Design a protein around this ligand. Sequence first.
Ligand SMILES: C=C1/C(=C\C=C2/CCC[C@]3(C)[C@@H](C(CCCC(C)(C)O)CCCC(C)(C)O)CC[C@@H]23)C[C@@H](O)C[C@@H]1O
Ligand SMILES: C=C1/C(=C\C=C2/CCC[C@]3(C)[C@@H](C(CCCC(C)(C)O)CCCC(C)(C)O)CC[C@@H]23)C[C@@H](O)C[C@@H]1O
Lengths: 238, 238, 10, 10
Amino acid sequence: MLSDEQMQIINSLVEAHHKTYDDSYSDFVRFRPPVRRLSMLPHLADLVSYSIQKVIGFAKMIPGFRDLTAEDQIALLKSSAIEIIMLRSNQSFSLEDMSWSCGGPDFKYCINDVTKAGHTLELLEPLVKFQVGLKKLKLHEEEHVLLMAICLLSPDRPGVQDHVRIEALQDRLCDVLQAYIRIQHPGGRLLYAKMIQKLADLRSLNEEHSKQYRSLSFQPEHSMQLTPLVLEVFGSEV
Amino acid sequence: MLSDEQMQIINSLVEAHHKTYDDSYSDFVRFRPPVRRLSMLPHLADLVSYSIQKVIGFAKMIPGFRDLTAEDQIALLKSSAIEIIMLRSNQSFSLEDMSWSCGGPDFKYCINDVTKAGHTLELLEPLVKFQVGLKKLKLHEEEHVLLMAICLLSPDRPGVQDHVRIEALQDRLCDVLQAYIRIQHPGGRLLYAKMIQKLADLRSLNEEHSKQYRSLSFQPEHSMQLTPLVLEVFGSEV
Amino acid sequence: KHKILHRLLQ
Amino acid sequence: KHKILHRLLQ
Ligand SMILES: C=C1/C(=C\C=C2/CCC[C@]3(C)[C@@H](C(CCCC(C)(C)O)CCCC(C)(C)O)CC[C@@H]23)C[C@@H](O)C[C@@H]1O
Ligand SMILES: C=C1/C(=C\C=C2/CCC[C@]3(C)[C@@H](C(CCCC(C)(C)O)CCCC(C)(C)O)CC[C@@H]23)C[C@@H](O)C[C@@H]1O
């Protein structure tokens, strides 16, 4: 069975998530409205920008993260943000209609829509594949929140400094996850390994996005549709 | 009576305006919705950003402007944009309710609202005064469009180079305006001088905005609400 | 800078 | 740069 410190980690993460994720998606009406040349760009840019702020909020509450140098914090956020976005978005994803259901017709996001935001079907495909596979793991809220913190504390991120301390923090988290599945998750002998796998699939998805985004980013008529936060997090200014 | 060249200028300006100004304000639903900490900021930032693009569009069609160096064009836009914004906004201003009426409750803009976008009443007052006074001049569409082009081609703008050619273009425009009022505007012996006056009131309003904006601009939690175009036009990068 | 304006100015 | 992130990180 788990220890006191590990259990205090589970609480903190679960609380952080609840505090930064609304299952009713009521804030989406404050974004520039969706429109089905990259007519979805304005809306999705806002959805992503909103989410960064949320990932930041969650991150600030990951035990150990607050103590990292401002630079490393920034370094981890910049390189993992999009991955954390994809992970948390799974909660709104539906195997039923292969889309992120956040509202009526307006906030239901089809693969098609992400295209009207400058993204091809070729790379939109692996995202759905990742979403579907991840959904099938029927993760407990405690595992979903752990995986996000693991992802965030990957020492292998361009720009990181104290990669030894990042490495250590991530390992402490990886422990709690393995222990938790062992004790609390009936029927999950492979789960862990499966979850670790997901982290690598995210890396590809990340790299892929970087390319797509770079292109978009360089055309001023498009970058003018993005928000300051997006431009900053995905920007390449050292 | 007017000449052929002067009359060709009137047409071009009137057409440019019609092409860049919608009296139905139907595009406002694409902006982030208004909300009555600077809750109106997101919406107004979008309203202003939209307008810059429109002022650019109009500018590109001012006879003579297209031939200026890219730098001078940029220099004139950066320093006059806000002034042109205030001028064209007069069309939506209503002496009846002292507000810019662009839609139902949502798009009706009260002095109060601009406050929820980081602007004090002290300086919001002179704007209304300017709007009211300008409205009372019952300008013809031909005079309103001329005044905007005059304003835009003021040689006295920080950053301008060929101020002699700017000076000349503005004078050609000032001619057409004086001639037009003489020939076509029954009862306007003072009008011209009154209009030229307005240009100076704009200068103050401009300077005032610059200060307000600078403050806002420097607080990241606020500038993150603005758009790339606004940040660029009002930014101070040489 | 002024990348956006340069583009909008065609 | 990174003015926004620095601020959001408190
Ligand atoms: C955000 C959240 C939601 C859905 C996620 C989506 C649907 C729209 C498009 C997104 C945002 C994907 C996009 C990134 C688009 C952004 C930009 C700036 C236009 O390059 C995909 C890029 C990834 C691939 C590999 C497809 O190229 C990643 C996750 C997808 C809703 C809710 O669950 C909150 C969550 O928090
Ligand atoms: C735009 C247009 C319209 C109205 C104009 C308004 C109402 C809202 C607030 C504005 C946009 C004033 C603001 C500038 C706010 C912008 C920002 C970035 C938040 O610092 C005022 C600053 C001037 C004073 C002197 C008040 O400080 C200037 C003109 C005012 C509607 C339509 O007519 C199109 C027009 O095209």
